[PDB]
């Protein structure tokens, strides 16, 4: 009848005096002949039939100043009828919100006391809201938080309910959801910058990891096989990554959980040991390899400046990668010289040079080809090295035939080969920043000018070539000669003669003066002023773009090494982890040192 | 100097220049073919959905028009 809708309307506004009469009227209907049973009739009448929303969820969704008395009366009525196990643990059934319970609503509606009274009455803290809304596909269909009540209380800045949930001994902290994520992956996934949220996520990570007290949460892979460390590196979240990489827990009884270790300190001088277990290229899918080879994330060059990564790149640049880079530069330079002299001068002593040209071209086209076909802006030089190697062997295959078109391939391979030598301008900071300035200027300003200049040139070429009547009495005889004569006129070459064979000399002169104003005065001089803006903008950023461009060559040279010859790894065992010494000095705070790993300071 | 000055303003001048062509193309349409209007009735007004997210203030929500969140 109209009973269930009346109780549903009563629990919305706060009609508590209506509710205490509707509930006792419902248990007058309990005295009527059920023909099902006693408790499931109350389940059929107290819950909606469409989606499964109970009166408890209906009251908790609609917070009013009379809410706590309503849910107290509802729980007392469910208590006195022995239905409380299947009332307070009821869920939804529809596919959008499947799995949502009343504790999940009471946590989201910021009701800490009602949530405490819910879990004190026998709620389920291990519920999973595995619906489609709670596990959406994009950022605006729903809200992914980890589909547990503990992860919901964590990712909504409610630390009191987090303490109250973790103090409950029925809570399963090491749970894994449908994505395989535990709570720490979810806290990583929710986390953002400081300008969006004022770093409560780092503090929640700290509190939950310290209240855990072990290493199981940090070393758990999700369904993609990622730890929270690798997931924070993958999604590019520097604020939580800087905390996880340099994590000093001061007190004892939980200090294996740390990643940094201040091992000695005298005065302001102190040396520290950074852990390098999953952060070094010795493993399979490491943090450094993720944050270098990342393509979907924009702020990589703000993550490589972190404390155990920046020195880790410098150490392997100084150890082996500098000599390997110089050796590759010398090999490519001799290859280009031997290609150049062979192309320019066209016996027995100088036939080994063509062999060295050929085998190195085949090696480069193999290596760059299998470099391109495993990556699926940051890959331009692979393409240019590959084309420069393909043109040489194409010219060889056309030279073994009788075709005279081999020289057009050889000249193109020689000019592109000498243009390719600007790849080795990294390695020097002063020339590498100049090269990335060249690249940003080519992208942002040059071709944008070139489009407008081309449409002006080809629009005035037909216009000037049209009003020419005809001894070669005029230079502007056709379209091609007119665009050649207009192209020579803007780089300042030749002479300007206006005594052409035109019927309208004044219109010819007016169009030519309009071209001079539009290109020489407007366009070419606006190119300088427009590039000054981008040179101003890139100059505070380019020093990090060069470091990001260099670390890729660092890691590729790391990959080139054999199974042996990796005796180039880092510091020893100190319950023993590969560490990294970083020395530091600061006259700032002056605290007494009680958290050292070594008594005697010096090495 | 003027390239420095216009560069923090020109992105809005372009949007203003584009909205005029938007509205003239709106005017070019016939009496029919304006099945391109916006969202439905919800005491019923033509509305417009805008989704938003903010971890700033964290107030409890009592002023909603719909209980079940998702579409
Ligand atoms: C003629 C070709 C000369 C090629 C030399 C190219 C050296 C480029 C250069 O300016 O080196 C700078 C100084 O220039 C020199 O090395 C002295 C040049 C003497 C002849 C070089 C051979 C390096 O210091 P910096 O000014 O702080 O660099 C800025 C850091 N982003
Ligand atoms: C875009 C490239 C369009 C080039 C078309 C073209 O060159 O055809 C020439 C003219 O074609 C046109 O007029 C196309 C004009 C397109 C302008 C677009 C702005 C034919 O004359 P010619 O061969 O140059 O006379 C020289 C004596 N042999
Ligand atoms: C300073 C701003 C930077 C300028 C950037 C782009 C400007 C492009 C200027 C292209 C001028 C090409 C016009 C030209 O070369 O004239 C004629 C057209 O040249 C051609 O071969 C056809 C088009 C070649 C375009 C090559 C790539 C552009 C010379 O050919 P010809 O000796 O008369 O033989 C025809 C048979 N009787
Ligand atoms: C835009 C102004 C373009 C006016 C060009 C012009 O007046 O050309 C004169 C007439 O051409 C025209 O502009 C007639 C077309 C009127 C279009 C009015 C523009 C609006 C020809 O010069 P000329 O007197 O035959 O040369 C003899 C040597 N002293």
State the order of secondary-structure elements of chain A, H for helix, E for strand.
HHHHHHHHHHHHHHEEHHHHHHHHHE
Structural class of the helix and strand makeup of chain A?
Answer: mainly alpha
Strand line-up of the largest beta sheet of chain A: 1-2-3
User: What is the makeup of the main sheet of chain A?
Assistant: 3 strands, antiparallel
The beta-strand count of chain A equals: 3
Helix content of chain A: 40-55%
Question: What distance lies between the first and last C-alpha atoms of chain A, to the nearest angstrom?
Answer: 85 Å
Question: Number of helical runs of chain A?
Answer: 23
Question: Which ligands accompany this protein?
Answer: the ligand CCCCCCCC/C=C\CCCCCCCC(=O)O[C@H](COC(=O)CCCCCCCCCCCCCCC)COP(=O)(O)OCCN
PDB class: membrane protein
Keywords: ion channel, trpv3, membrane protein
Entry title: Cryo-EM structure of human TRPV3 determined in lipid nanodisc
Chains A, B: Transient receptor potential cation channel subfamily V member 3
């Amino acid at each position: 009848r109209r009973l269930k809708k009346r109780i549903f309307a009563a629990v919305s506004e706060g009609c508590v005096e209506e509710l205490v009469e509707l509930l006792v009227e419902l248990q007058e209907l309990c005295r009527r002949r059920h023909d099902e049973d006693v408790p499931d009739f109350l389940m059929h009448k107290l819950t909606a039939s469409d989606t499964g929303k109970t009166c408890l969820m209906k009251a908790l969704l609609n917070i009013n100043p009379n809410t706590k008395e309503i849910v107290r009366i509802l729980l007392a009525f469910a208590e006195e009828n022995d239905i409380l196990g299947r009332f307070i643990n009821a869920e939804y059934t529809e596919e959008a919100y499947e799995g949502q319970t009343a504790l999940n609503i009471a946590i989201e509606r910021r009701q800490g006391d009602i949530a405490a009274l819910l879990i004190a009455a026998g709620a389920d803290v291990n519920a999973h809201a595995k619906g489609a809304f709670f596990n959406p596909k994009y950022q605006h269909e729903g809200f992914y938080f980890g589909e547990t009540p503990l992860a919901l209380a964590a990712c909504t800045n409610q630390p009191e309910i987090v303490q109250l949930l973790m103090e409950h001994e029925q809570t399963d902290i090491t749970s894994r959801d449908s994505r395989g994520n535990n709570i720490l992956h979810a806290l990583v996934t929710v986390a953002e910058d400081f300008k969006t949220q004022n770093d409560f996520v780092k503090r929640m990570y700290d509190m939950i990891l310290l209240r855990s007290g072990n290493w199981e949460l940090e070393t758990t892979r999700n369904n993609d096989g990622l730890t929270p460390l690798q997931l924070a590196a993958k999604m590019g979240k520097a604020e939580i990554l800087k905390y996880i990489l340099s994590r000093e827990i001061k007190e004892k009884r939980l200090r294996s959980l740390s990643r940094k270790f201040t091992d000695w300190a005298y005065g302001p001088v102190s040396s520290s040991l950074y852990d390098l277990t999953n952060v070094d290229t010795t493993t399979d899918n490491s943090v450094l390899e993720i944050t270098v080879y990342n393509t979907n994330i924009d702020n990589r060059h703000e993550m490589l400046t972190l404390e155990p990564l920046h020195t880790l790149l410098h150490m392997k640049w100084k150890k082996f990668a500098k000599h390997m880079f110089f050796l590759s530069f010398c090999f490519y330079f001799f290859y280009n010289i031997t290609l150049t002299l062979v192309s320019y001068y066209r016996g027995w002593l100088q036939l080994l040079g063509r062999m060295f040209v050929l085998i190195w071209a085949m090696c480069i086209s193999v290596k760059e080809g299998i470099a391109i076909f495993l990556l699926r802006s940051d890959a331009w030089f692979h393409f240019v090295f590959f084309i420069q190697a393909v043109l040489v062997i194409l010219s060889v295959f056309l030279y073994l035939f009788a075709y005279k078109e081999y020289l057009a391939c050889l000249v193109l391979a020689m000019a592109l080969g000498w243009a390719n030598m600007l790849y080795y301008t990294r390695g020097f900071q002063s020339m590498g920043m100049y090269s990335v300035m060249i690249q940003k200027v080519i992208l942002h300003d040059v071709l944008k000018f070139l489009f407008v200049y081309i449409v002006f040139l080809l629009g005035f070429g037909v216009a000037l070539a049209s009003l020419i009547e005809k001894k070669d009495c005029s230079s502007y005889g056709s379209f091609s000669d007119a665009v050649l004569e207009l192209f020579k006129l803007t780089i300042g070459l030749g002479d300007l003669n206006i005594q052409q064979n035109s019927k309208y000399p004044i219109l010819f002169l007016f169009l030519l003066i309009t071209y001079v104003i539009l290109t020489f005065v407007l366009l070419l001089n606006m190119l300088i002023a427009l590039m000054g803006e981008t040179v101003e903008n890139v100059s505070k950023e380019s020093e990090r773009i060069w470091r990001l461009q260099r670390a890729r060559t660092i890691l590729e040279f790391e990959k080139m090494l054999p199974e042996w010859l990796r005796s180039r790894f880092r510091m020893g065992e100190l319950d023993f982890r590969l560490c990294l010494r970083i020395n530091e000095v600061k006259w700032t705070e002056w605290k007494t040192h009680v958290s050292f790993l070594n008594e005697d300071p010096g090495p």
